[PDB]
Amino acid sequence: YRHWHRMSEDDWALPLDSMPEDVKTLMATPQTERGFVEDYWYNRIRGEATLLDPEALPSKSYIALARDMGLQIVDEPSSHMMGLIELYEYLRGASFVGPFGTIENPVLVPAVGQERVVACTGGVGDEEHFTLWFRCREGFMYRCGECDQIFMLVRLYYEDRYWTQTLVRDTFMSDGDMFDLKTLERVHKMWNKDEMVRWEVGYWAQDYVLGKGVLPGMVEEHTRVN
Amino acid sequence: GCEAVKNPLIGGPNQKARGAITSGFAGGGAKRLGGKGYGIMADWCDHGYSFTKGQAITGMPHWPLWCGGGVPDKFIKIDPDVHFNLQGYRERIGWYGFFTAFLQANYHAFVYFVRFIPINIAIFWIYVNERQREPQENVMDHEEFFRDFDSIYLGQVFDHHRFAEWLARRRAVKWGYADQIHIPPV
Amino acid sequence: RGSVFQMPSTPVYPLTTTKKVAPPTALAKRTPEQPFGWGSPVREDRAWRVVPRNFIILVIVYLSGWAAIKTMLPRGGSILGQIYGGPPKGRLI
Amino acid sequence: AYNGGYPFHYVVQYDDPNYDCEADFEFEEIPRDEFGVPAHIPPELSTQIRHTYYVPPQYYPFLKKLGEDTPELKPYTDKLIMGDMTYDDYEEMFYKFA
Amino acid sequence: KHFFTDGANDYVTGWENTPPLKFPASVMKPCDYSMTKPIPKHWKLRGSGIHGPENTDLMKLVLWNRLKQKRPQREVPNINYLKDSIRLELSVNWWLMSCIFLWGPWLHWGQEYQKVHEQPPWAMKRIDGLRGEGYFTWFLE
Amino acid sequence: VTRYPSGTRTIMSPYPGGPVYQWLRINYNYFKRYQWRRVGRWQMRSWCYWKAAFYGVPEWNIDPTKNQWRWCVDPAWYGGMRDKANMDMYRLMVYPFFGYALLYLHSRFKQNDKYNVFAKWR
Amino acid sequence: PPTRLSTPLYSEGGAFTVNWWRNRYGLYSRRQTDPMLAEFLFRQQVKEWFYDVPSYNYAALVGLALGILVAVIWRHFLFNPDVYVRRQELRKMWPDRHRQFAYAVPYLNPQLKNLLLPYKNSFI
Amino acid sequence: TGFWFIPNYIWWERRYAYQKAGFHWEHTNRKLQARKEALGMDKVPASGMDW
Amino acid sequence: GRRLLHGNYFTRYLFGSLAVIWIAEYAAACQYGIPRHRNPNWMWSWWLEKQNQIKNGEIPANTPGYAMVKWNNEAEQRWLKTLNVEAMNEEFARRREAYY
Amino acid sequence: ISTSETLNQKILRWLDVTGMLTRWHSRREFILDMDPYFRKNSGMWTEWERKTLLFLFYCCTLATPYSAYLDLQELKHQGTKPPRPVSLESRFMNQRRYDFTWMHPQDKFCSECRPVELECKKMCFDRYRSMDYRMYGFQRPRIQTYYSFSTC
Amino acid sequence: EWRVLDFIDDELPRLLAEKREIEKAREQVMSKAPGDYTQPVFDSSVVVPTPANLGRNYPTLNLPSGDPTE
Ligand SMILES: CCCCCCCC/C=C/CCCCCCCC(=O)OC[C@H](COP(=O)(O)OCCN)OC(=O)CCCCCCC/C=C/CCCCCCCC
Ligand SMILES: CCCCCCCC/C=C/CCCCCCCC(=O)OC[C@H](COP(=O)(O)OCCN)OC(=O)CCCCCCC/C=C/CCCCCCCC
Ligand SMILES: [Zn+2]
């Protein structure tokens, strides 16, 4: 959005030193129990394990492929929530302009709390009036006293929580078959051999499953000076 | 008071039990000295580039802004749980620790003064070096000047070395040290 | 280790033949005693001792020299005056 | 058309595996760009050279499956299989299906 | 340009109101739905209708304005842009050259002439009997 | 094509140059890269005014939810005890300042002979 | 004033027109982030300030006041015998400033002074 | 407030009395005339210097 | 890339303003009939006549102006007691001989 | 004198003693004269930007000696500035309502002298020294000190 | 690739073989009927990067080899 500042380096990828060292437990943790860093590396390890196995991709369904990469198959419930989330974020630093509100289609006023201050400017052209500010509280269909424009408050609330991308992913995504560490090892040997590492994440991940320091050059990789 | 003050350390175990964090150094993770690491890695000592050794001690700062990002947990040394929670911190650090913390809180101001003072010393040297010297003869008699206007007003441009010598002899006469100095011949 | 953007042109990991023992922090793990920093070697915090010590010495030298100059040299208009501001030797006032 | 054409974030590569731009003070190593172009070849010249993505041939059957299931996606997948997909072609594919 | 302007010289965030011209309209187009044909009455409003990311063009603008921040190479600007970027720098440098090779020589000549004739070569010699160089800018007399 | 060490051989002439020339070229190259630039590297790294502003500030955690001290704590006290100590030290100087300021008022009051208001007419 | 963004706004050519104003209105604006929104805000401002009849009265008053102001400044510099920008006369004693004394009488007899002085009989 | 007023008060009162007695050089001059009277010498070496 | 000012605004309004100032000043001079011939000298007629006499050799060279007035102030009386124009001329003559 | 090169090449070689010309005509040589940290960003520069930068840098560094010459002549001129006539005290000249003490509010050194009136201060310092009070300055002849710019 | 280009003198025979194999594979996959996703038949040992040949550890060539005094 225009109100956001510049992408960080982390916005693209995370450093491999932030990979959890207990990979064996990481790949067995349920999604609802994974933190932001743990969830990043669960998806990256599992997603790259399937993508770096070309011979199996054509026989893998889009439902299974999306699960491996950690992408959520969309549906009307989740689409509604995500859309209203992105609309809330956009309105943080953007103007609020849209069609005239009526009983059939009230002006939708997203909010996290139970109230949001709103102003009615009336219709277009000569039907526009001076700003009339009012407090839009949930559970009431508001009508402007001047132009009769109907307003309504929409709350991004779900089960004692507000709506977030993390909440939407946890509520609607279902964990599939438990990730098999044999796949990690098999793909690791595929792209990492004879001092050539073409899957750096899988070389670090396999090292942790082995106990940290087992694979060649990994003790030297983990030895820091400050 | 606390163990941390008694035995200052940077990034050890049992930080919470030790009771305080005495080092403002943040970051690390470099594989070599002076190498690319995480965090900003700033301190009063043992950081940056060593002039005497001509070697890098820590790498360039990794800012927590767009140009960089967060620090991996493996290399975090200032735990906010212990860094904050200042309840009764004065008892943990003692009076000398309080003095140390105050002095260490002004590293930014110290960094500035180290960069600002040198030029000002140079400017002051200009003043001191000039103040020692006798004043030049700014003015002479109004009448005598106009009776020899051309020589005085234009002597410098025509021959500056002889004009300089003439000025010196007049200074020696105006301050009564003519018989105590030998003015070099031109 | 640095940015995720800088990388080697050829991705190679050395098969180190040296038999040096592994530094303790190289094989370390997060622990309840060490929630953070377990991958970095512990070091001495010289600043905590050197900053307050050096500051005291400089202040003592600064004040002691100032007192000395203003009490062990003849009275004068400035410090430079009290050092190089007397009349020429042999000039009786 | 932003920041004078300088990307805010970009990849740099180094030939020496143990090279550190912050610790070392040598004067012989020449950094490369994301495509591998050495830094001594100016941007105006390297940007004219055509760079295409080469995937291992074991991926061709997968890229073929994608094209058939989504015919609108087929022309982009065909370019990738034939080694004719530049970065610009990839960007067009990415934003077309958003 | 030196000064930052949100609309034109937005280098702090790099935001651009419209997509690159290189992109086909089928891939990305400027966010402009002013020409939308009238909606049939039997169509029903599903979305909010509010101007925002529900519109495809606006969504793609936001997406691109964030994913454009990483690029494999530089987008070389043309020489016209490069000249404008350092217009003041180049002009000041030429001003320094003028001050050394144009102002310098004639100023020296004037002083040397003044030495011999009492007044600069671009002044009217006086007869009043007053002494000194006198004015230098003759056109401000 | 033979590649010489950077900055050691001229490309302007097929003749490398005479002994004095080569000495000047080699030694200036060394002085710039390994002697003069020691000062610049020292100032840039060890005395950065912007690194010093972040001295004593906690690391920025990669986990986004572990940096809440950014808004839970005011920026003036991001430094923990160091920043609290600086405030506390200046706090200790309040009453010394009051005595000092009160003395100035007394100094002016006395110098203006305002204490002799009654003695003047007695 | 059109109410649909599809209907274009007429602009003259020159340095103060609808097109000239559009180019510069949003230079410092954080709110004009896309064409649709930018045009809506631009027309909103134009409608409010340039289609307001009474606003044009103030435009007349600023022009009149500024024109008088610029001219009175210029007149002092160009004609007032006591304002010196050149230095020739200031490098001479008062009795020798003939070129500056030439401004005196012409400046002492402006047209309006001759035209309005006869009307003192309406005050005395 | 009074506690820290005392040391400032004492310092200023001594300073004020000194300043009323004369300038710094008038003070050193009075000690020079006294030294010239003690020795009966019209001109004596300046302080910190020998004869 | 969008422009706010005239493409050559700095030179345009600098040289342009100077041109308008110069032209307006000429117009103002014409309307008031101001003499436009620069005189760098003082206009004291008696003084300029004394200066011509010096140039003609009627008054000896380097003779001060206070050696020619009919009223002298105190400081000029002080100077007249030490004034020797004849000696000054001889000294200048000696300098010329040495130089050549 | 070497005959293995042309006269033009010899002149250019000597002007390249510091490598300036070589860095202009070789991109590789310019990038390898940068310290490694900044060499990382070099590949993005255009040749237009690179040579324009060198041109601005070279013009500046080549004019510094000229400014240095102009400044030295200025110092010499001030070091031997000609004496000027003593000012007659005109109708509105040398008006004083109070002594000059803003520099020394408490000490009140040289109350009669003006802030940078060096000759008045010298005689005033002499009085203080004659009164057994040391003052700094105005004692060494100019020609016997370094950096005076008054020596023949 | 640019890194390989620095060693084209030695890699040329492999590069020519690699070119042929990639072309064979492209042809086979393109010509296959829709729904046929079998792997192409080619010699992967000459194609880099692939599991069969993960490449070579190329030495840096940024080393001066000339004496400035000659
Ligand atoms: C067939 C066609 C041939 C045409 C030939 C054209 C020849 C033209 C020659 C022009 C020569 C100009 C020389 C100017 C010398 C000025 C020297 C000078 O003043 O130096 C001092 C002065 C500073 O003095 P200060 O003491 O500081 O006093 C002033 C400030 N207070 O320094 C400067 O001005 C520095 C700049 C010096 C510039 C010298 C310019 C030389 C120009 C040569 C041009 C040759 C053109 C040849 C064309 C050939 C075509 C076939
Ligand atoms: C960039 C290349 C180099 C340029 C170098 C220029 C160097 C000199 C610059 C000096 C300052 C600018 C003015 C120059 C004026 C030149 C002509 C001149 O001498 O003018 C003299 C003349 C009067 O001279 P005197 O005969 O002594 O007086 C007689 C009785 N009144 O003065 C002027 O005209 C110049 C002073 C006024 C300048 C500005 C014009 C006056 C009106 C100002 C209006 C201000 C309000 C806002 C206006 C907005 C735009 C309409
Ligand atoms: Zn309404």
PDB file of C-alpha atoms in Angstrom, chain D residues 6-59:
ATOM      1  CA  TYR D   6      18.324   1.234  -9.080  1.00  0.00           C
ATOM      2  CA  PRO D   7      16.418  -1.659  -7.465  1.00  0.00           C
ATOM      3  CA  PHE D   8      15.952  -1.194  -3.732  1.00  0.00           C
ATOM      4  CA  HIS D   9      16.999  -4.844  -3.236  1.00  0.00           C
ATOM      5  CA  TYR D  10      19.216  -6.862  -5.594  1.00  0.00           C
ATOM      6  CA  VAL D  11      21.346 -10.049  -5.560  1.00  0.00           C
ATOM      7  CA  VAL D  12      25.168  -9.954  -5.678  1.00  0.00           C
ATOM      8  CA  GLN D  13      27.419 -12.993  -6.238  1.00  0.00           C
ATOM      9  CA  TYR D  14      31.095 -13.600  -5.400  1.00  0.00           C
ATOM     10  CA  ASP D  15      33.429 -16.138  -7.019  1.00  0.00           C
ATOM     11  CA  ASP D  16      35.494 -16.848  -3.898  1.00  0.00           C
ATOM     12  CA  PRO D  17      33.420 -18.981  -1.475  1.00  0.00           C
ATOM     13  CA  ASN D  18      35.064 -17.425   1.607  1.00  0.00           C
ATOM     14  CA  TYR D  19      34.848 -13.803   0.467  1.00  0.00           C
ATOM     15  CA  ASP D  20      33.475 -11.131   2.796  1.00  0.00           C
ATOM     16  CA  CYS D  21      33.007  -7.595   1.500  1.00  0.00           C
ATOM     17  CA  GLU D  22      33.252  -6.244   5.065  1.00  0.00           C
ATOM     18  CA  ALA D  23      36.211  -8.156   6.527  1.00  0.00           C
ATOM     19  CA  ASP D  24      38.506  -8.352   3.503  1.00  0.00           C
ATOM     20  CA  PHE D  25      40.321  -5.367   2.011  1.00  0.00           C
ATOM     21  CA  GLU D  26      41.633  -6.920  -1.187  1.00  0.00           C
ATOM     22  CA  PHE D  27      41.373  -5.204  -4.560  1.00  0.00           C
ATOM     23  CA  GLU D  28      41.058  -8.012  -7.125  1.00  0.00           C
ATOM     24  CA  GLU D  29      37.615  -9.598  -6.623  1.00  0.00           C
ATOM     25  CA  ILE D  30      34.895  -8.409  -9.018  1.00  0.00           C
ATOM     26  CA  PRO D  31      31.260  -8.832  -7.886  1.00  0.00           C
ATOM     27  CA  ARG D  32      28.599 -10.252 -10.213  1.00  0.00           C
ATOM     28  CA  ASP D  33      24.871  -9.533 -10.569  1.00  0.00           C
ATOM     29  CA  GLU D  34      21.893 -11.888 -10.253  1.00  0.00           C
ATOM     30  CA  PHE D  35      22.297 -13.145 -13.828  1.00  0.00           C
ATOM     31  CA  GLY D  36      26.036 -13.554 -13.244  1.00  0.00           C
ATOM     32  CA  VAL D  37      27.202 -10.521 -15.225  1.00  0.00           C
ATOM     33  CA  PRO D  38      30.560  -9.262 -13.893  1.00  0.00           C
ATOM     34  CA  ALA D  39      30.425  -5.757 -12.473  1.00  0.00           C
ATOM     35  CA  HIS D  40      32.973  -4.443 -15.007  1.00  0.00           C
ATOM     36  CA  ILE D  41      30.436  -4.979 -17.864  1.00  0.00           C
ATOM     37  CA  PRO D  42      28.239  -1.766 -17.652  1.00  0.00           C
ATOM     38  CA  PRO D  43      24.439  -2.035 -17.121  1.00  0.00           C
ATOM     39  CA  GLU D  44      23.646  -0.406 -20.463  1.00  0.00           C
ATOM     40  CA  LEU D  45      25.383  -3.305 -22.225  1.00  0.00           C
ATOM     41  CA  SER D  46      24.353  -6.199 -19.974  1.00  0.00           C
ATOM     42  CA  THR D  47      20.676  -5.213 -19.984  1.00  0.00           C
ATOM     43  CA  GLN D  48      20.706  -5.562 -23.782  1.00  0.00           C
ATOM     44  CA  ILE D  49      22.071  -9.112 -23.565  1.00  0.00           C
ATOM     45  CA  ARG D  50      19.167 -11.560 -23.474  1.00  0.00           C
ATOM     46  CA  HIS D  51      19.009 -13.760 -20.368  1.00  0.00           C
ATOM     47  CA  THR D  52      16.554 -16.656 -20.152  1.00  0.00           C
ATOM     48  CA  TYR D  53      15.719 -19.060 -17.344  1.00  0.00           C
ATOM     49  CA  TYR D  54      16.886 -22.658 -17.769  1.00  0.00           C
ATOM     50  CA  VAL D  55      15.098 -25.223 -15.610  1.00  0.00           C
ATOM     51  CA  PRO D  56      16.386 -28.815 -15.471  1.00  0.00           C
ATOM     52  CA  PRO D  57      14.728 -30.931 -18.177  1.00  0.00           C
ATOM     53  CA  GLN D  58      13.097 -33.109 -15.519  1.00  0.00           C
ATOM     54  CA  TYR D  59      10.705 -30.193 -14.951  1.00  0.00           C
TER      55      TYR D  59
END
